[PDB]
Design a protein around this ligand. Sequence first.
Ligand SMILES: Nc1nc2c(ncn2[C@@H]2O[C@H](COP(=O)(O)OP(=O)(O)OP(=O)(O)O)[C@@H](O)[C@H]2O)c(=O)[nH]1
Ligand SMILES: Nc1nc2c(ncn2[C@@H]2O[C@H](COP(=O)(O)OP(=O)(O)OP(=O)(O)O)[C@@H](O)[C@H]2O)c(=O)[nH]1
Ligand SMILES: Nc1nc2c(ncn2[C@@H]2O[C@H](COP(=O)(O)OP(=O)(O)O)[C@@H](O)[C@H]2O)c(=O)[nH]1
Ligand SMILES: Nc1nc2c(ncn2[C@@H]2O[C@H](COP(=O)(O)OP(=O)(O)O)[C@@H](O)[C@H]2O)c(=O)[nH]1
Ligand SMILES: Nc1nc2c(ncn2[C@@H]2O[C@H](COP(=O)(O)OP(=O)(O)O)[C@@H](O)[C@H]2O)c(=O)[nH]1
Ligand SMILES: Nc1nc2c(ncn2[C@@H]2O[C@H](COP(=O)(O)OP(=O)(O)O)[C@@H](O)[C@H]2O)c(=O)[nH]1
Lengths: 232, 232, 246, 246, 224, 224
Amino acid sequence: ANLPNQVHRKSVKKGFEFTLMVVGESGLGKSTLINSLFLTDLTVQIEASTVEGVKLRLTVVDKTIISYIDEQFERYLHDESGLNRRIIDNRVHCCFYFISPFGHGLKPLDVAFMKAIHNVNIVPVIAKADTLTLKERERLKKRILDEIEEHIKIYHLPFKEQTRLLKASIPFSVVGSNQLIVRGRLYPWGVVEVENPHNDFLKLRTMLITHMQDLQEVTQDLHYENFRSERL
Amino acid sequence: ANLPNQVHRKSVKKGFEFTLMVVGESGLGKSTLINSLFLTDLTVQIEASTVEGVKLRLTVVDKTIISYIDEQFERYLHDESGLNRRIIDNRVHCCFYFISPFGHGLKPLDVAFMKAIHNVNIVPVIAKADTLTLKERERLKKRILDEIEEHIKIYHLPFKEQTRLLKASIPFSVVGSNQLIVRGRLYPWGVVEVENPHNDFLKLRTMLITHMQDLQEVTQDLHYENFRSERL
Amino acid sequence: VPLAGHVFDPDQLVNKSVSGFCFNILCVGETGLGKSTLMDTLFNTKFTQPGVQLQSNTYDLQEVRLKLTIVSTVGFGDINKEDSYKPIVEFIDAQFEAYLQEEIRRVLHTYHDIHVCLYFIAPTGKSLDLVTMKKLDSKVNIIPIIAKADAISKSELTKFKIKITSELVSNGVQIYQFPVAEINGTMNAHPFAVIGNKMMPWGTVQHCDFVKLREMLIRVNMEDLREQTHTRHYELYRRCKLEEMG
Amino acid sequence: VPLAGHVFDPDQLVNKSVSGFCFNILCVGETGLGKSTLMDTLFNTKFTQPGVQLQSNTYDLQEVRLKLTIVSTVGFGDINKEDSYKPIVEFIDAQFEAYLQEEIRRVLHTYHDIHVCLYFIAPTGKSLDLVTMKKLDSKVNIIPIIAKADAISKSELTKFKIKITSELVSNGVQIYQFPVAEINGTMNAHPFAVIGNKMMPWGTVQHCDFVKLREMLIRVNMEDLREQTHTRHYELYRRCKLEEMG
Amino acid sequence: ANLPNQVYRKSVKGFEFTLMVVGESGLGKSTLINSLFLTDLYSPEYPGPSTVQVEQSKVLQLLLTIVDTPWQPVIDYIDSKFEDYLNAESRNRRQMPDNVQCCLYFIAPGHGLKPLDIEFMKRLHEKVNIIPLIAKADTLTPEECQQFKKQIMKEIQEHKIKIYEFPLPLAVVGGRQYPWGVAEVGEHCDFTILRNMLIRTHMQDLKDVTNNVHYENYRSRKLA
Amino acid sequence: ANLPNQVYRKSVKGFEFTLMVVGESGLGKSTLINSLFLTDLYSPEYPGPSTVQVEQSKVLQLLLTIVDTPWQPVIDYIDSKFEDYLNAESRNRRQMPDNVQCCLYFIAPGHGLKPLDIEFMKRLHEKVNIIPLIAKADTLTPEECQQFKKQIMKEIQEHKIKIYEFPLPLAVVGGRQYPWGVAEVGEHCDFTILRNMLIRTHMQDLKDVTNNVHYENYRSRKLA
Ligand SMILES: Nc1nc2c(ncn2[C@@H]2O[C@H](COP(=O)(O)OP(=O)(O)OP(=O)(O)O)[C@@H](O)[C@H]2O)c(=O)[nH]1
Ligand SMILES: Nc1nc2c(ncn2[C@@H]2O[C@H](COP(=O)(O)OP(=O)(O)OP(=O)(O)O)[C@@H](O)[C@H]2O)c(=O)[nH]1
Ligand SMILES: Nc1nc2c(ncn2[C@@H]2O[C@H](COP(=O)(O)OP(=O)(O)O)[C@@H](O)[C@H]2O)c(=O)[nH]1
Ligand SMILES: Nc1nc2c(ncn2[C@@H]2O[C@H](COP(=O)(O)OP(=O)(O)O)[C@@H](O)[C@H]2O)c(=O)[nH]1
Ligand SMILES: Nc1nc2c(ncn2[C@@H]2O[C@H](COP(=O)(O)OP(=O)(O)O)[C@@H](O)[C@H]2O)c(=O)[nH]1
Ligand SMILES: Nc1nc2c(ncn2[C@@H]2O[C@H](COP(=O)(O)OP(=O)(O)O)[C@@H](O)[C@H]2O)c(=O)[nH]1
């Protein structure tokens, strides 16, 4: 009958929580982009903050790091056995990872980050391609893609075309302003807009809201088997 | 942002499962009422069947029975430790319990059913009050209620008035037709309708759809502590 | 023989004006199908816890007059109330007026001498009653009645009357009915069932199988069961019991 | 003294027509900020895996003509490429023409005799370069350049040029500039930075700090760094090294 | 409220009754049998030494028993009536008749009370209800009829015998007519009185007390 | 494409040059010093037994060195010029001058080649570039001037001395005028030739080869 209605309002009390964990070569506006993905603002550091509404626990890189996720897939699974329950996880609801704008192939550093990180949850991405042409842009799309290929595991994105469109331009290249004139980056040669294509900024803004159900994989996939490796 | 939208459709794939377990003095159209609560049809027996959509695992009485719930709160909690997961519960998503239409107070039998059953999930109810006047009807409402009172635990019902209305006429008195003329019960003295008040039939039809989140208590409350009694 | 000779001057009318005049009815039934609500409604005037309890009244009525005991009596639930309680009244009512009547005589002074029970059953679709009615097959005068009549449709009163009859004879029991008797004899077979103020769901309340039990039970065949009762239960009551002393 | 006597008949013009005429440029930089894309764009014509690799070309140009070696060279990543590679060319380029010139003479036959490096840094907001440029503080002739110039706003080229300068001197390094020299001398200070086809986001590509590095680097102060280079790195190259034999 | 006990009369469907005569049999007991009853049976009153008793039930039906036999024997007939059936009472016993014992007795002259008239009544007193009458009572001038009425009733008040009553005595004209004049039934005869109060209108009491008095005479006696 | 090397001329900013005379000093070397140079210094050519060498740089600025001294000594002056500075070469050494050594030598009669003219040149051949001229050359009728030209050049082709060239010889009119007529510079004198090719237009080669030949004469020699 109806329950999708009464399901719907039900996050109304409760909804919702995202943690994601940023890596990338600083550089390139991880923290400037995120805020305008977020319309707000700021060897690792931590981000928990909230908006009209939802809770954010969100970790930046500034491989020590693979402790801290499985520190978190520890603490999930400590309490799950199970005595007592209010309670929390800081699970890695996704990660991002950021190649360059410039100079070509994909970096050995990115590779062996991107190999051994991968159980949690990447969106790889490109910052600052108002460097990059569409003739450049497409050039890195695929030779990234193939680079994935000699290999790989970031997260394959489980309205007909709204999906099937976003996915085929993965990965997508993105500039955050939080300045403007209409956001928002300033050239005397010419002017550069957010949220167009133009910018694959919104593919991610609108994708990553859309699903938030690495909720769901990170919970099924990556910690289930971190039980199933780690218990067993 | 949006996720209540994308939350909403999300039972679209998945939704949903109810088990409830009927007790009551046969008698009084447990199985005739249920079908028309259900628009479908049929020392214990079992009901699993599905409709435009949702899954039903739904057990009738025809106190052996308190094994079978905690048999089910066993099997929940067997798998939860935890190795492996597709998988299922037959949890008691609620129970119903049925006093008479006639003759007055509430039965010692109902009491000590209704005491020791209570961790799972009752809606008590009255069948066949086109026996009963509103001057009778109210009479049993409260002296039931007080009878609850010298005591008790059935489930307190966690759109402002749509709630606060249904709840203050608990409990509600109900006739299923599945015959009709407009459902549907036949008197040459006079004629008797479903779904009016008239009939508190729809308070339950519309209540019990509304919430189905004994889903949620039975899962929080009754099996959490069946861990917490039973583990500990 | 041939007393058959031929001829002017009631004797039956004489024993009419044997005007003082007495009766007992008991109903038995669960707490509470309106046995009391039956009784005042029948004579149009007003009269859950553990173990088998029987409740005692008697009252008096007119038009030329009569002295009438009503008991009803009550029962519930966790299930051998029913062997015990009615042997309480009924045997022991019943040996009693034997027991005057062994001894001095004749004072024209009894009720529960037991006369009728209504067993009232309830209505829908049972086992406590079956043994109750077969154990109370004994008898007293058991008339067989179905309570809160406004719980059924007529398509089911078709259905549940005439099923519940098979039941009477399934383990077959003793009963009442009467033998004249087209209308005595229609009405026995016509398992009967029974329903307030005036005048003349949403429920407006009386046609209904109320009268049929009114007019035979209370009008018509009226002391037959009085004398059945003194014939029957005095009679298995002494003859068993004199079986037992003598 | 007083050679100061008083008087008709260029000698400077004579050594103009010392027409044959030679130069080396090396860029060093990560794979791939367009060092090659720099070079053809500068002279308007066409020319990720492990360890420090340097790549070798030389070519020739006109209008009255000149023979010019370009190398560029490449580097990446897991981080002491940078001590090793350029000592590869540069010392050992550089002791070499010492080493002709110890011995027979004078054949007017070299490049990498090293002449300029561009180190190209990249652009945004670094440490490998700092040691790279301070280790390559040595020198060869290091001009200090900033790649894919269409990655920054002008409000940031305000910001990152003039921050990254503090960096040059923070651990302070050796550099180039020139000493005449208003316009030589404006343009040294004016950290410079650098951007295709015609004619005349959505990106249309040239005003831009391309020329400034064009016209001083390539036009103007032009052999100063040739002779700085033979003055400097021949000079610490032998004097250290003759420190070391003798 | 509908309370009839017009059931009670649909009921009998019988009613039945035993009804005793002593007399000097010249004179009109066997008339009062067949005439009280408006009916004809022959051959009821002739005996050997020493008793004659017919039941009939005819209908309109009673078992009307008359006994009439020509002290001890009608005593020891009637207890042995009486001990018979409340001997049936003590038995498993199925519903057996018959029980009325009262007297219709004549003694009929007239001037005084008849010595065996005296004795017959006195002892018999208990053991039915005794109704006495005076027979052939065209015998008497009634200015003379004044005398038998007074002197016997004085008679029995003195010698102290019980009778019936129902709440005189009763002088029994065997209608029938003479050479000079005819004598009627009455009034005339006070023999209607013994039709009215005998026949329908107090008949029940005399059996019920017959059953009640001397049933409980005969066993409350012999229970001792 | 902008490729100028008009840098290369902004460059000197100096240029500098050493320029040797032997002669019989009666006659117009010290004229050709001050006159070749269009300029006046006094007191350059008088000696004791046995040498006189002025640098000037004036400007328009060269260090123009002339040496002029009145075999072995100008040999052993000029190696000890020459070994001095490429002794500077081997040193940490800071950029020291000065290097041109070529001859302007006179010998000037005329009919034949002058015996110490012969010897002076022959040995000296290597150690600068030798330019020879013929002086006071209003001395000669040039129909006679035909003879000194031919006979010396034959002379040196035979006795086999090297000179300069740049790709005659050069007869040097000390303008100046007489009782009868005045004699000009020329043409007249072929002394413009020694202005044109000496002065600006091949000046570079004679230093560069001066530096190059007999620098690498003097050390490729003494490296052995
Ligand atoms: N709708 C409906 N209500 C009835 C009917 N019969 C009885 N009732 C109601 O049920 C109640 C019966 O109560 P009682 O009259 O005390 O019945 P009871 O036999 O005395 O019950 P106990 O005293 O416990 O033995 C009455 O108040 C009526 O209002 C019926 O036929 N239809
Ligand atoms: N948008 C933009 N793209 C640039 C810019 N400079 C270079 N590129 C692009 O980046 C690429 C640079 O590649 P190369 O010219 O081979 O650079 P490289 O120095 O030779 O790199 P390596 O060979 O690995 O050392 C070119 O294909 C250009 O399209 C720039 O300033 N802006
Ligand atoms: N033109 C342009 N500039 C960018 C873009 N993204 C980032 N920037 C510039 O790079 C800087 C980002 O620095 P920051 O966010 O602190 O780097 P982070 O710590 O790695 O996130 C900003 O000052 C921007 O001016 C882009 O897409 N286009
Ligand atoms: N009038 C009336 N009859 C009812 C009502 N509920 C049930 N009935 C009758 O009672 C019967 C119910 O029997 P059933 O469903 O098999 O009893 P159960 O096994 O206890 O559920 C039906 O035949 C109906 O006719 C009601 O609300 N009103
Ligand atoms: N004159 C007259 N004669 C009577 C009267 N009553 C009876 N009789 C006659 O007298 C006789 C009396 O004898 P009966 O009645 O047979 O008595 P029983 O001797 O016991 O049989 C009868 O035959 C009658 O004919 C009466 O009132 N008047
Ligand atoms: N007639 C004539 N006299 C000359 C000519 N050249 C120089 N003289 C003179 O002859 C002298 C030559 O001596 P000088 O030039 O001083 O050579 P020095 O002996 O080395 O100093 C000078 O004093 C001149 O006056 C010339 O061409 N013709």
